[PDB]
Design a protein around this ligand. Structure first.
Ligand code: UDP
Ligand code: GAL
Ligand code: MN
Length: 291
């Protein structure tokens, strides 16, 4: 049951005046695409605080990637769901390497020890298995957000993202035609998507939803990866290829714009991005991914 909102004074939405004319703000299946200017965060914060929403955030920090936790967590404290209840779940092979980060009230951090796989592909792919923990999350949080660790928050990331199931536009592909997307193109893979299909190219580094929908998605991607492995095939972009196939066949109920996953070193600051909210931390793939 949802109680009434209180009285609020804010600018009237004007029907004959779009919030944004330069971008698509709704998908053809009627899911909002979340850009700055499309939401009044005061209304959304009221709606979500009246439900006492708890948001879980999963992040894997395996092997050398424990070096990224301190900045990840400290900037998450400044920008991620401030005001709301947050439960961080840090999955790591080195619990003693997790930094002691000071948290705001109503926020908590659990360390979950897991095994480390040797190949960075397997570390990244096996997040889906590891996330799909199911009983714990159902009891502790309302939504789950699943992100890469090699990142920092630079601006607000809040309840405007929450919905039963979301993906995020990949920042290198948001202006690309579908034939250029780097979907898995071999029909022998469970992740396969033909050249005339596909809505968007979603990035593996930021997806989420209600616990039930996120467990559905990670269970389906893990089972699809297992099928591929048994068939001796590994999709071209690993978990990201599987996430893409899942979100093609199960349309997300919101899509985040590239505000929410950006790489300023590689892509700069285009005018279409009014805010850069969650951004890549520069790293040397070869070095950090190997002993
Ligand atoms: O040795 C590794 C390799 C990957 N990851 C996790 O897998 C995610 C995806 O890998 P990565 O960020 O290397 O992919 P990229 O963004 O560079 O394509 C990382 O953010 C970490 O959460 C990890 O913890 N240790
Ligand atoms: O083409 C897909 C790839 O695009 C890259 O820019 C990104 O670093 C990879 O992780 C993968 O998403
Ligand atoms: Mn990453």
């Amino acid at each position: 049951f949802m109680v009434s909102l209180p009285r609020m004074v804010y600018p009237q939405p004007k029907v004959l005046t779009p919030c944004r004319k330069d971008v698509l703000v709704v998908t053809p299946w009627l899911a909002p695409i979340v850009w700055e200017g499309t939401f009044n965060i005061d209304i959304l914060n009221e709606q979500f605080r009246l439900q006492n929403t708890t948001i879980g955030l999963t992040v894997f920090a395996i092997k050398k990637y424990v070096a990224f936790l301190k900045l990840f967590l400290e900037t998450a404290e400044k920008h991620f769901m401030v005001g709301h209840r947050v439960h961080y779940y840090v999955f790591t092979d080195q619990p003693a390497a997790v930094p002691r980060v000071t948290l705001g009230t109503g926020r908590q951090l659990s360390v979950l020890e897991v095994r480390a796989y040797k190949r960075w592909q397997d570390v990244s792919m096996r997040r889906m298995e590891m996330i799909s923990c199911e009983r714990r999350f159902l009891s502790e949080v309302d939504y789950l957000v699943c992100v890469d660790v090699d990142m920092e928050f630079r601006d607000h990331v809040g309840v405007e993202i929450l919905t039963p199931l979301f993906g995020t536009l990949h920042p290198s592909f948001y202006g690309s035609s579908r034939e250029a997307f780097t979907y898995e193109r071999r029909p022998q893979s469970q992740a396969y998507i033909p050249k005339d299909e596909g809505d968007f190219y979603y990035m593996g580094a930021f997806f989420g939803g209600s616990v039930q929908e996120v467990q559905r998605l990670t269970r389906a991607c893990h089972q699809a990866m297992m099928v591929d492995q048994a068939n001796g095939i590994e999709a071209v972009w690993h978990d990201e290829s599987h996430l893409n196939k899942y979100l093609l066949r199960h349309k997300p109920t919101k899509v985040l714009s590239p505000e929410y996953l950006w790489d300023q070193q590689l892509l700069g600051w285009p005018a279409v991005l009014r805010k850069l909210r969650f951004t890549a931390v520069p790293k040397n793939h070869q070095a950090v991914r190997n002993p």
